[PDB]
Ligand SMILES: CC(=O)N[C@@H](Cc1ccccc1)C(O)(O)C(F)(F)F
C-alpha cells in the first residue's frame with residue numbers, strides 16, 4: 287500500500303500472508319472461518335504454498351504465527367485470467383487455524399448487499415509502499 | 418465474524 | 428521500490444463502476460469494484476488481500492485486491508474483485524467441501 291500507515295499489531299485478524307516454500311510473501315488473504323481462506327485467483331496458489339496467520343512484522347521471529355498447510359485450491363471456474371475477472375480462489379486448510387485475539391474471521395456480504403460509491407472502506411497488506 | 422478482538426485504529 | 432516488514436493499512440472510498448470506467452474503460456466488469464484514486468493505492472504484494480467496509484462495529488469483505496495502475500498511482504482507482512458477485516460461489520464451495 288502506497289501512502290498507507292502501519293497497522294495496530296493484530297487488529298486485522300483475518301489478514302493472512304501467502305508465502306511460497308522459501309518463505310517469500312507473494313499475496314495476501316482473508317480467513318472466513320477456521321478452515322478456509324479467500325484470496326485472488328491471480329495469486330496462482332498451489333498446495334506447495336503456505337498460509338501464515340497471526341503475523342504483523344514479517345521481519346520478526348518473536349511472533350506466535352500459525353504456518354498452515356493448504357490441502358486444496360479452489361479457483362472459481364468463472365475466473366478469467368486474461369481480463370482478471372471473477373478474480374477469486376478459496377484455499378481449504380489441511381488443519382484448522384486456531385482462532386484467538388490475533389486470528390479470526392472477516393464477514394462475507396449477502397449477494398444482494400449494497401455498498402454505495404463514496405463509502406469509506408479499508409484495505410490492508412504487505413505490498414510495496416513505494417513503487 | 419468481523420469484530421477484531423484488538424480494535425484497528427486508522 | 429520498498430517492501431514493508433510490518434502490515435500496512437489505508438482507508439479509501441468505493442467508486443461506481445460507471446465512474447471507474449472513466450479511468451479503465453471496458454476493462455471494468457460487473458464482478459469488479461473500484462476503490463481509491465484518493466491519495467493511496469494498493470500495490471504489488473497486496474494482491475489477494477482484503478478490502479473491508481465497517482458497519483455497526485463489524486467488518487465485511489467487500490473486495491479482494493486484484494489489479495490496477497502499473498505504477499500504483501494514487502490518483503488512479505484500484506480494482507478489486509466484487510465479493511457480492513462471488514459470495515454465492517463461496518458459500519456453495521464451502522457447503523460442498
Ligand atoms: C521464514 C521467513 O522467511 N520469515 C518468517 C518470520 C521470521 C523472520 C525472521 C526470522 C525468523 C522468522 C515467516 O514470515 O515466514 C513466518 F511465517 F514464519 F512468520
Ligand SMILES: *[C@](=O)([C]([C]C1=[C][C]=[C][C]=[C]1)[N]C([C])=O)C(F)(F)F
Nearest residue numbers: 469470471472473474493494495496
Ligand atoms: C498484486 O499484489 C497486485 C496488486 C495491485 C497492484 C497494482 C494496483 C492495484 C493492486 N496485482 C497485480 C495484478 O499486479 C500482485 F499481483 F502483484 F501480487
